[PDB]
Amino acid sequence: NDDDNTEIIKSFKNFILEFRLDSQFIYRDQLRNNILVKNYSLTVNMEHLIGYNEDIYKKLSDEPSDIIPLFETAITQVAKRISILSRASLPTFQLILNSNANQIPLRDLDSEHVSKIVRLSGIIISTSVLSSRATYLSIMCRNCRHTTSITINNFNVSLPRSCLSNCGPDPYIIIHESSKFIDQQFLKLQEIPELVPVGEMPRNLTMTCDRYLTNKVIPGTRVTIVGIYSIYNSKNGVAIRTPYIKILGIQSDVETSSIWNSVTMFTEEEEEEFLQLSRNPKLYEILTNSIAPSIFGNEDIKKAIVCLLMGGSKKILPDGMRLRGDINVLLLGDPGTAKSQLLKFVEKVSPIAVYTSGKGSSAAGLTASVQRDPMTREFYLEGGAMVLADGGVVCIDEFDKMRDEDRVAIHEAMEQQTISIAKAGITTVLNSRT
Amino acid sequence: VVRDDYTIEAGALMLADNGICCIDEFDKMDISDQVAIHEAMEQQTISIAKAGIHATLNARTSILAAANPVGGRYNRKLSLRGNLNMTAPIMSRFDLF
Amino acid sequence: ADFSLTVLRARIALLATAIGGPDYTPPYKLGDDCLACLKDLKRWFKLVDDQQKRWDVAMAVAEYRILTDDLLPILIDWENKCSLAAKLANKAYYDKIALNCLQLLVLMTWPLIVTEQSSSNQITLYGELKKHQLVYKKTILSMESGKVLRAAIRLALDVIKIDRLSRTPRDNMVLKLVLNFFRNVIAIEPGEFTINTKKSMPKKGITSIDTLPPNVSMDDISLNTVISSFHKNKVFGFLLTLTSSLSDFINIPLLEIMFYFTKDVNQELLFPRTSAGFELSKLLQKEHQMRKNVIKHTSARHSRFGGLLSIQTPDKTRLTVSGSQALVDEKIALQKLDDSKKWNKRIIKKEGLPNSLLNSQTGKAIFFTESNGKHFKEFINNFIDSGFNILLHSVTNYFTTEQDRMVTLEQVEYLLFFAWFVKYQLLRSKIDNSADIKQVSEALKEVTFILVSSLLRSAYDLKNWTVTHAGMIAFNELLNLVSRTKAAQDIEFIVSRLFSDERIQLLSNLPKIGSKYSLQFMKSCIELTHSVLKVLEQYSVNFQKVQANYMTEPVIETYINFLERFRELEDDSIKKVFSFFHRVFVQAKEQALLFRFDLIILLREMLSPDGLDRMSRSRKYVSQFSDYFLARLKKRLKKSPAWFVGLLFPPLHNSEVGFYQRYGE
Amino acid sequence: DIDPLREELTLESLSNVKANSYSEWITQPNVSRTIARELKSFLLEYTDETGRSVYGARIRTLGEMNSESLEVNYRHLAESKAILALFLAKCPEEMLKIFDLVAMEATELHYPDYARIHSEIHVRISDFPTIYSLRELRESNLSSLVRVTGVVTRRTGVFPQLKYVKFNCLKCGSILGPFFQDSNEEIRISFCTNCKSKGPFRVNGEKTVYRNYQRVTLQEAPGTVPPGRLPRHREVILLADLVDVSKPGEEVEVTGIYKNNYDGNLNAKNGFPVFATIIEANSIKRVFSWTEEEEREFRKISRDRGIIDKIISSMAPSIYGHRDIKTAVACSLFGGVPKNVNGKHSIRGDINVLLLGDPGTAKSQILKYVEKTAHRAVFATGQGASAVGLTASVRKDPITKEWTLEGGALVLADKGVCLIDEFDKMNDQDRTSIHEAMEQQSISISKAGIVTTLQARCSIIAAANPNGGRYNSTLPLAQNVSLTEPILSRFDILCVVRDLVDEEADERLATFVVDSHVRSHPENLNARQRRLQRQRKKEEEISPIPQELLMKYIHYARTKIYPKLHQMDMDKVSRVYADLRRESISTGSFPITVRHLESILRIAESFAKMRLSEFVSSYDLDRAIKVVVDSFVDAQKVSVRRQLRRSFAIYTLGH
Amino acid sequence: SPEQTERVFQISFFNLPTVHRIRDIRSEKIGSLLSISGTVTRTSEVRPELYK
DNA sequence: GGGGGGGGGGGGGGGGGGGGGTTTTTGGGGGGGGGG
DNA sequence: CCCCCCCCCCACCCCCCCCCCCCCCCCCCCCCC
Ligand SMILES: Nc1ncnc2c1ncn2[C@@H]1O[C@H](COP(=O)(O)OP(=O)(O)NP(=O)(O)O)[C@@H](O)[C@H]1O
Ligand SMILES: Nc1ncnc2c1ncn2[C@@H]1O[C@H](COP(=O)(O)OP(=O)(O)NP(=O)(O)O)[C@@H](O)[C@H]1O
Ligand SMILES: [Mg+2]
Ligand SMILES: [Mg+2]
Ligand SMILES: [Zn+2]
Ligand SMILES: [Zn+2]
């Protein structure tokens, strides 16, 4: 078996070391450039893997859960060969996959896709904390102190049942000092709204990412995913098991504020395009034309909507006082004056936004709500529309039909940019920059 | 609509399906309480959309109402319309007074 | 390997489709080449199951329902053809398939027996294969009130018509085959739950012995169904006129049929000796006596009330028990302190014949309906009045020969057949003066005594306890009859010299060994002993010389061990035991031999309120015995304090002190 | 005489059942081989009376759809080799096992290498003749095929479930052969066959295979359970192709196997050896589909010059007059074209209608008819509708212990109609929930940490009485009814229904009503065929096209046809809207707004839809203008209605 | 034929001498025949009990 | 002819292995009470 | 009298147990005195 695994590993080593287009060894260069900035991963385009040697892609797509670890191993060996002098240490490199295969919509994924590489898209509705998973367990026997170690690959693992040569019935314990761990995050992906069938409730999948794919995306972002559609045996029918996606690649339509507040991401070409756009003399008129272009007239409202999107400048003073930077606009008036259509456009164009209707809202449902975590039996705080809109806009349509004590709950978050909760023994002032 | 989940508890006009429902002191019933039976009166059904429970329910019922005149005393100088707090939507639903 | 088995079962299923089926134009209709198919199935029985010792065809044929769904329809419709034609008279061909159907019925109903010589496959398949024979018995009796039985007698009448001279060996065989069919249909009985004993028993034993398949009930199999269907098909009339016509190739199966009728039915059940409801009230009162007894053995307050008695003994030491009633009754406290022991002494253990009176539970009655009782009793009455003496003479005139090759089954069924009808006619004659003892006169012809003596002596010498027990039973009824004809009056004097010496010794030695065997073995030993003693007393070579051979401790151990079952014995049996004690103890005055503590305990347990019926005649006899017994024991202890210890032990066979222990000077 | 692995029997032998039980007979291999040939012969040689093999055509279609399911009609099996039909009823678990293999063989014969597309076929039995209610299930139904009706009360997610599973023994040679997983019990391995001993076990890693799974709670339909009694229910299990063929609140008819199993929980809490039970589904039904000939019939009748009028006359045929209401209902029920301008601006296609008027004028009956006729429909009278019961609600999930959404009526009827009878009786907090779903065609809940927007693509038709119970033609509309302008403007056709005494009109209406009552009396070639023929004879007296045809025609026109505007009389619609706006300055009048301008276009598109015409003609637009102008004019008080109708006549009486 | 199973027989007694109330339950009457009256406050689903 | 010794079966005890072990917030409906 | 508000109720070691194995005890049979 390990002879064949060695041949697979050598085949991938050759793919990294030999693949070349227009005089550039793109994977050698990418691996080196990643090593210098100390991200130990490689992004592979499966078009290139198919083009190199379609037998390799056949092995990978037949059984990715066995072949992806071997590819990662190959990447480690090349990483050492191109960044450490041979005969004068690095972790196991994550493999990230880019693909243009035909997507399966989230609702169509089923038993025929188990253990296959799958491509899909949706909106991330939740992101859990960074749990820790072992890559390498240092192990020893509780009685005779036989010491060994278990390398782990996270594609579906256990300790051994009895000692590897009396030691008692269940003999092994972990040694955490010499064991190694990685970040693991859970995301919940909900299917695209315009792809939901007629009269159906929108379906969602739990899915996991690890190493450098953690914290890459945040709730509300629309994403496309490459991953192994796979199963886990929950503690809860008969012979029934929970589906999930082991993520191998994430590609958001755009990246915004995922784990960054002062950091940014812009290319030189788009920065220069924005710079020469900023210098245009008719810029305000062009932006006003861009707002809701199929809505006639309402020019001062469109001008105000540009101002609301842009916002002012937030300020913090030696007093300690904070001055509100964002802008609030109310459209009050007659029926069919395109107010709701304008709110729809603003929710569509803003980089961060939420749309709610006042009669569909709640005080908690808007600012933030207390929840009880069921198996912990303990209270925690979950964000409402103001939290999800933080750093952007909340479009409160149908505002006059909001119940008054729901309406009053907006006051602090609307002026002080904060939500002062005091409930169930929780006391916090969450930020809401909306 | 009650918990046990959300589910439907049969009222009087459900229990008298293929039957007779007798409402005493009908006139004292609030208009909010009166207008609820306009469907069971004539369409022979009750339709509900509440709390995630949606149904239409059979109320094939002959209703017998025992209204008082307004002020108790029946004023013989006034119309039957004038002697009651009912109005044409529900009076047209009765076969006879 | 099991591939051969699925090939076999496939073949039998295809054959099952070839026999025939219903026709919608409902009537059953034979298949094309039906005679060849029936012949091939008979071939399968011989070819595989007999010659290879398997019973796989016998299982597969039950799986594909050939008997119930083809052969009985064929026979019943053929019977209808012949019976409808008989009022009006290609039958010459259909007669052949009717005969071959009866051959197949005799095969599939053949009485299964398992022994050490049976193959591994046979002993494996035995338990489930029996169940299908029970289904066959149900269907044969029930279907159209059992008109197949009328088909069988018609097949027999079609040789009885041609003369005793005319009947060829094939005709004789066909008649014998019909008798085997009747015998088999009587003989099927539920199998025994044969547990494997390699692995130890769990904390709960076997859940139930019931072996009947789910479409059968024991009432379907009961004698009531047999008697009803046989009456409604006049099988009894056929058998009666057949034995009337005995003037012998078929005599063994006819004997065997009468055995299989009689083997498990008690004679007194056929005689009375609102009435059912009145007797139900009597039964309810009898168990209400047990209720007023167990009530005194029950706490007047709840179980957790738990007041503690302490028994201080005659010495300076104390025991403790929680019995709330026992606080006021040391009798209860003592026997509870005894029952509290976790210890029990370990106890010891201990086929080619059916169950019978030889081995049933001692009170196991057959619950006739009144009509079935009438039909059965009148049938066996007419048999006694016609067929008994000739049939017994026929079979005993055989059985004097070939005793060496008489298989054990044949021996036991013969002895039981003799005994049952002798006992019955004695009872019917004790009831009705119109019934004659001489109507069973063949029992007393000396050839019969010689044969039954030979069977008993040989079985005892050969240590065949089964035939020994049956011959003992036969001796009991022979002596019963002999005593009656002694009163009715030469043959009595003749046998009363022939049972001298070796026969005295043998009969004396049965109840020496009997204590080791089942309750029915002991019961037959006691019954024989009482019959022997009353016969010898009626004669009264010397009386003391014979009875001294009985009055010894192994016989007393048999008597005590039999009497341990007193709650489950019948009152007459307790009377018989206590009449034996009356002779031995009061009259023969070997009273030392009964001063032993096993009897003392047994006397108290039956004289206790938890023992015998307060109004029982046997209770009166035990009380009458016990007063005199206690008086004599009191006297002997006053004359011998050594006997306070001697009471615990076997008496001393060292005669030099043994005589002094026995009589005390 | 015969090879034992190929011994086989005649059909009369199969009727001559002679095992102890049906299942023992089906599994007897000579019988099993014969049954295989029998069902194969049925699928080959059973024909329609046109001589076509039905199952030839269905297998052809199955492969064209790449389906795993073959629809078999039970009655076709009762019509030929009926012993197989009896076996199928009495012993479906074995018989379907054989019939599936036969169906796979038949399609592999018809489509070679269909094993590459699906390795297995499931015969989905339909038209099983005998039906039970969930109250009516009993012990005698156990392991029988049953046909049951109910409402899907609670649908769980779609899961993979093991189908064929090998196991590993940790002792000896590990791998154990593939067990087939059922719907009720885990595989129990009492001992390992390879070492004939107990042991621990794990699912094998070398190979295992999965099938889709989904439980459904099926409950007594609320009108079918007798009053006072509680609704009974059973768990239904959907496997493979059947998952998500239904959604919560839908009434369904289920064909399946009523099975049971030991469950220590049921025994534990009840104290008797009493078993849990399910229905393992083999078919699910919700009537609005069509055949190629039915499609041709729609195409044929669509050519008729009077087809819009024949449709309109056919709307609610047993209601006299009210041709304006029938037009409004027709326009609503066909609907406009929903549009999306480069993805940057989405526009409502649904047409909302308000039936405002006097008592005893068939408004509720019209709404009940529309509930009868529309392909997705929901009905909720007045005080019976809460705000969240109309749009959507959040509940603390009882088994998941978390918040989840529950779709209201406007979710259930998405791409359909919602029917609010006695609309004026609603509480205003309930009424104002309608707004977002009624114009933006969505519901945006934000509650309990849930934040999302649902689709609510409904045409809402509502029926109301005026204030005080009766209309007043000396008052303008806003004084006749308490509804505010933002909700009135969303109902973009208004029909005002006045009950006036008028001698010959009442004569004609009363004549029609008494004729309808005798024409509806219950007492008023086989008998069933004759009765259906008599029903058609009765129906053609009042419906110019068959109602059964009209439902499928509506569904066809809705799903296939999307009329474009072209050659537009832009100046005419502009002048119509400009004049409607000017004359609507009357303070109480029907509040003309831009959504009414778009309503003209929706209505014209719906009329082109009625013709199955992918372009809107001038006739469609002119009829739309006539409807909208008449709806506006009709709402005006008598003091001005003649002058306004005369003024507007130039746009409408030119048609 | 396939073996149409043994029929079970329910022996439904009625018209007893007296009616006991729910409060009159007393454990000497375990195993005895009674008639009982009350009002049905709830009912189970009808289920199969394993008998034989 | 009875008692001792040898041999076989059956039962019991001990050891070893294995498996099991409520208040607080949010939303919704319905009922009751107060103000114009 | 009607409508709106607001109030209420509801969702890893230790013990018990079971299985397996070994030895001892009790009975039966055969031989010897
Ligand atoms: N100026 C306009 N240009 C284009 N379309 C318009 C304009 N005004 C209204 N509409 C159309 O009319 C509808 C406007 O609906 P909407 O956006 O809800 O208006 P609104 O101001 O929110 N009225 P309301 O929700 O009752 O207060 C949409 O179908 C628009 O396409
Ligand atoms: N034009 C008509 N043709 C036939 N039946 C009619 C007509 N108008 C009224 N009816 C009958 O009137 C009865 C009541 O109809 P319904 O639909 O309840 O009227 P409505 O408009 O809803 N009145 P209301 O509920 O008080 O607002 C039904 O049984 C109809 O058959
Ligand atoms: Mg709006
Ligand atoms: Mg109405
Ligand atoms: Zn160890
Ligand atoms: Zn194993």
Residue numbers in the entry:
A (entry chain 5): 20 to 107, 131 to 198, 205 to 213, 235 to 305, 320 to 517
B (entry chain 6): 612 to 615, 620 to 712
C (entry chain X): 13 to 37, 43 to 106, 117 to 274, 280 to 305, 329 to 405, 412 to 550, 556 to 606, 657 to 781
D (entry chain 2): 173 to 458, 473 to 710, 738 to 868
E (entry chain 6): 255 to 306
Which sentences from the paper describe this structure?
Upon termination, the replisome is disassembled in two steps: first, CMG is ubiquitylated on its Mcm7 subunit by a cullin-RING E3 ubiquitin ligase (SCFDia2 in budding yeast, CUL2LRR1 in metazoa); second, ubiquitylated Mcm7 is unfolded by the Cdc48 ATPase (also known as p97 in higher eukaryotes), leading to disassembly of the replisome. Despite being driven by evolutionarily diverse E3 ubiquitin ligases in different eukaryotes (SCFDia2 in budding yeast, CUL2LRR1 in metazoa), replisome disassembly is governed by a common regulatory principle, in which ubiquitylation of CMG is suppressed before replication termination, to prevent replication fork collapse. Our structures show that the leucine-rich repeat domains of Dia2 and LRR1 are structurally distinct, but bind to a common site on CMG, including the MCM3 and MCM5 zinc-finger domains. The LRR–MCM interaction is essential for replisome disassembly and, crucially, is occluded by the excluded DNA strand at replication forks, establishing the structural basis for the suppression of CMG ubiquitylation before termination.
Nonetheless, we identified a subset of particles, which was subsequently subclassified into two conformations (conformations I and II), that had unambiguously translocated onto dsDNA, representative of bona fide termination intermediates produced after fork convergence. While the configuration of the MCM C-tier differed between conformations I and II, in both cases the incoming dsDNA was bent by approximately 46° between the MCM N-tier and C-tier, necessitating distortion of the DNA duplex within the N-tier. Having identified particles that had translocated onto dsDNA, we were able to build an atomic model of a terminated replisome. We observed an additional, large region of density at the N-tier face of CMG beside Mcm3 and Mcm7, which closely approaches Csm3 and the dsDNA ahead of CMG, before extending away from the core of the complex, forming an elongated arm characteristic of the cullin subunit (Cdc53) of SCFDia2. Density corresponding to the E3 ligase substrate-recognition module (Skp1–Dia2) is adjacent to the N-tier face of CMG. However, clearsecondary structure and side chain density enabled us to build a de novo atomic model for the remainder of Dia2, encompassing the F-box (residues 211–247), 15 tandem leucine-rich repeats (LRRs) (248–716) and a C-terminal tail (717–732), which folds back onto the concave surface of the horseshoe-shaped LRRs. The C-terminal end of the LRR domain forms an extensive interface with the N-tier of the Mcm3, Mcm5 and Mcm7 subunits of CMG (see text below for a detailed description), demonstrating that Dia2 binds directly to CMG bound around dsDNA, equivalent to the situation after convergence of two replication forks. The extensive interface between Dia2LRR and MCM is predominantly formed by the Mcm3 N-tier (helices α1 and α5 and the zinc-finger (ZnF) domain), which forms a cradle for the C terminus of Dia2LRR.
